[model samples]
Target: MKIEEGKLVIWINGDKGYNGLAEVGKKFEKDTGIKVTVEHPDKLEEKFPQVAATGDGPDIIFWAHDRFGGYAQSGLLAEITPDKAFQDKLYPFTWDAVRYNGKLIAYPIAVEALSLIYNKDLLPNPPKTWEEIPALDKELKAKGKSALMFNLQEPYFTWPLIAADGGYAFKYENGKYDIKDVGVDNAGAKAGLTFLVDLIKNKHMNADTDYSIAEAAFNKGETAMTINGPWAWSNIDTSKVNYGVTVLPTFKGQPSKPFVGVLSAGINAASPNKELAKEFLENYLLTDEGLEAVNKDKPLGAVALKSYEEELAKDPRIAATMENAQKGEIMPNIPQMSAFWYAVRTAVINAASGRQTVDEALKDAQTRITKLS
Candidate 1:
């Protein structure tokens, strides 16, 4: 897996991920005298399948860990096991996220997961359970405020409830997700959505709360807290508000584990320079300065390396993200998950809008998701 003497080409999926690694690409070029050309595609998931098969793709691709499953299944990703030195640099969970079908495929760089971000001015002490939210809402209403606000319409925000109750996207089979084993409409999902209905019924939260409305409310100090990720940090102007973040509260002892995603790097199966790509990724990409450069302008996520934990610890957001991510499950990246996303998101919205009952919506969602297999 080594490229002797040629330019190294790489593809970066999204903007923020591109931002994190943009300068590092230049640094690699300068350090190795290897012409490293980095490309940021406008639509990665859409364009990846098309370009990859045509024999024109990067030596390495930087993207969400979820995309790895599909690419690997399609034979687009090359399997390259890292040396013990490189493997030891990553957190165990981060390493696990990049593993599919029992082969090491990617370099787990950064981790992202939802956490409780609250305006300290409104809630000096955040609650420890979803059960306590109602009481807190009641307490806040007395002060002409709302307890919490989150994107009720988005499944990413709402799925944590069902996940807390043991619901899942699909059953893990052997080394991958069993498309046949759908868990979108399971008992834990029911426990979660039913509880959401309670919140809507008691008027603690609105069924119409989307990201815009929820984010605006939190930034304006209209709500005490919001369940959001670190990417939303830009929306909150800390100068105007006092804010704090922590892991999401539990419901009856189970933490409301939000979906986790890690940004990782993998070699292209079509690339002839895999060994060289491995050298670039391991020797350069995993270095302390290498990881640091990626996070210079935009702190992407909690890094997988414990060596960076001290710096990550100083920032409460990074600390809470990594802590909560450890407790959460990785977002399933199998191709079957593509069907689950739309179906479950629609089910959540339908039930929230009262257009259909929770049971009816989820049953339909389950059926649609199953059909995709």
Candidate 2:
């Protein structure tokens, strides 16, 4: 379908490759004679529904998948059904990120998850298991360096440690998130919590470490290793630190699985240029060439397209993120997931600070999450 108005507008987060996408829009306009406008406004997540309700929203919205479920439930997203052949071109797991209540609502663009990032100059051989880290931590400390570190206050970074033995914020079965089922307080999760609390108590990791501190230390070469995502690679590269990325080490003999986040684009239900937007998405923006264009300025942490596998093999950071994404859990896309953040953070803070026992902290977290639901 041709663009009826000869123009299409898209809203994307400024931090998520806005400049790269504006370049793609220029190319699209040149090829199809349809002008593409990309805008990244402030508080977009909060403003999107308000603008969409007025029927004056952009033709497309590019954002993370976790927000899709909320938009879909509010009737602000147009359901899309791409051909099976087209679907097969992406990683199979990516589909799960865009599906809300069994309906395809968006196209997955890239996937990212936390992985073990270590300074190669400091730790020549990264540990294969979590058990090996404590000893390594001692050795690094003697040399005036710290071992693995991450944002201890945020569950987004700590979920892997908690889920090492099978903790989950919400239960998923048959493609639906059962918000009533809170697993953070379960026996498996309690064990994970104990392990985390012990690490801080024993001085293996710093309880005061957060995202800013951990990332700064890693980039400045003060820390030996850190749990971080591919989005941080650009800064690390500029910092000129020789580093390597690897999958999260095994924790307590079980594989550590981080929460995978998918960035996606979806048609606005209120858009007047639906068909044109679909064409642009399917034939232009979502293609391998388009993604490569978007990745030019900022490496798309991990691309959803299988066509990038050859290129991925040449970039260790993105390849490691993709590998971890393959083994990780997709972050829950339901709106109920919003309740998880504050509740889990409270648990981590309380447990880590010795204000409450691990069991009590998680139990409070589970209760708070249920109440929020």
Candidate 3:
């Protein structure tokens, strides 16, 4: 059949609040002649599997990579063998996100991770090792400022420490994870938790600081360095605070690996026009429009936008984002991850507030989180 003779379908998550994918459909039709029908369902996570299985859904899905594992488990995700050339455009961590049960099940698009942003004038050279931070911090404090800042209240912000100390939420082996192997209360996690306690107890970093406090401190020159990501760029005035960014400092010779997420494209295993959908996704090269689609056509969602790529290419901040993301791990997409957020946050709050010891705090979290299944 001619390209114009065919009809194609795809689902776009409505919460993104954008029309780029629809724009892509328009462009795809203008050139290829395949008419694409776009579906925006508010509850894609709950509905995709059921609809796809019964032949009432789109062949492609556009959404976050975090749901890839559960969707794949529903047996509605096609096994994807991405072309070598297409894979080349992605960062290793971004591509790592869409894999499940030993198969590449989605089209990896853009990358996101928590990266460190610092005031360039405050620190001429950014420290790479954790031990170097205290001395640098001391100097900054004497000069009426703090060394490091971040949202400790945010559970995700502290994940790198758990990862750095060999603590993992789930035991992953050979690229697959076992949810039963929860490690929040493990010895290694305790060590990481102890380090966090020391940071607060020693007055090196404040535990109560939230995102707004940390971000404002950095912008106003009250803090020399902080951990945040691309979304915060607009909040800081570059004219006043000359900025630089890099991967977070390592702890005990290990990187504080943040969670990297990607907005990926997935194919419905039961779709009748699998070949056509595959060709459109797999063979298409990512240009400015593709990057826009991934970024929701705005810098609000990500730092890696192509319309701003020429600007980003010259910006040293993005330079570090690309490097740091290479070392981060993807946010796991399994349904079991549902129990993680509050459990981890509560444990940190308990330990930091002296409500419980790191050991006891995590132990309580483990018991609480285990009830998810």
Candidate 4:
């Protein structure tokens, strides 16, 4: 591979780790005399596709893995094939996220997923199954608290329940997503939604509760449990509640796994400095030292690299999150995923709020998505 003389430009979404990356960039420049510039542009997600299409954008884009499919499908993302040494050093599930049509489209750095966070002071032993949850309502209510609470209207937080027994947004097979086969309205999905409706009817939850309301209730010790991700740690820490994070209790006998999300970076297909960009990613961003610098300012959500696994496991919250992540499904990366989000969000809102029956709501969502195929 011939190295180019041009500078390597990278566009990151925010400035959380700019100083650390800038330091690493300085080291890259010193060693290779190739200038590496990192930029944190506003509305990067919105602007990347527009600018990349014109062949006028950063050589690399640092963003979440879900967006990689759209860029790769549009011929704006360069496919990456890392050597076995590099691939073996990262989590296997992270690969599931960076691939598009069986081709690798990006390099993943961190992973995140939702998990059950419980107040240890209120619930000495976390419930092991969904059936156990409703049983806690009586005891908790007598103490002026709720047993379990989460955003009943949000699809992300509720996906584990919806997918508890084989419900999925699309039929995935042979490493590809069949957009035409949306399964959200199937029997399994209906069972999941109906469970939520039952929770409301039992007064264990409220249909109107949203993320902010639910999280605040938990943080205030007004609720014994809530479903959320590691991102909520900052507030959770400040709330000063004695809490523990764990995989969500089972739905019937099946595990309730959250959607796994990966933070990654990909090369631009049209960049003249592709070779240099590749070198920097393969050598810098993928290495532990490189990742450490990148995450120096702000600890990454849940690092996907094996090097940090041992150290991260020491923190119980991170340990529980990573465990839950291993059991979770990667969010579908196809552009058609937009339809799944739209349909499910509407279905959850309608069914949870009694605007429609679970069967009617999910059936409507399923019909709406199938027509797009």
- Could you report the Cα RMSD, in angstroms, for every candidate shown? 3.9, 3.6, 6.1, 4.4
Overall lDDT per candidate, in order of appearance: 0.80, 0.83, 0.72, 0.82
Model 3 lDDT, full chain set: 0.72
Worst 10 residues of 1 by lDDT: 13-22
- Candidate 1 lDDT: 0.80
Q: What residue pairs clash in candidate 4, if any at all?
A: none
- For candidate 3, write residues 204-231 as lDDT tens digits: 8887889778988999888888887665
Q: Per-prediction TM-score, please?
A: 0.83, 0.86, 0.69, 0.81
Residue-level lDDT tens digits of model 1 in 1-373: 2332477877875435455565776777788777777777676655666666675667788777877888888888888687787687778888988888888778887788889999998888899899899999999989988999999876888888888988888888786678898988888887888888888888998998988898888898889999887767755754367888898988768988788988888888877778778878877767777777766645667877778755776887887887888788888767676678789999999988788888888899989998888
Report the C-alpha lDDT of model 2 over 73-177, residue by residue, as the tens digit. 889899988899989888777888899988999988888788999999999999988778888989999999988889897787888878888888889899777
Q: What order do you get sorting by lDDT, best first?
A: 2, 4, 1, 3
Model 4 poorest ten-residue lDDT run = 1-10
Determine which window of 10 residues in candidate 3 has minimal summed lDDT: 297-306
Report lDDT (Cα) of residue 137, candidate 4.
Answer: 85
| Top lDDT hit | 2
Name the better of 2 and 4 by TM-score.
2
Model 4 whole-model lDDT (C-alpha atoms): 0.82
Give model 4 RMSD, 1 decimal.
Answer: 4.4
Pairing residues by index, what is the TM-score of model 1?
0.83
Give candidate 4 misplaced runs (Cα > 4 Å): 1-47, 54-64, 81-85, 174-176, 268-284, 293-302
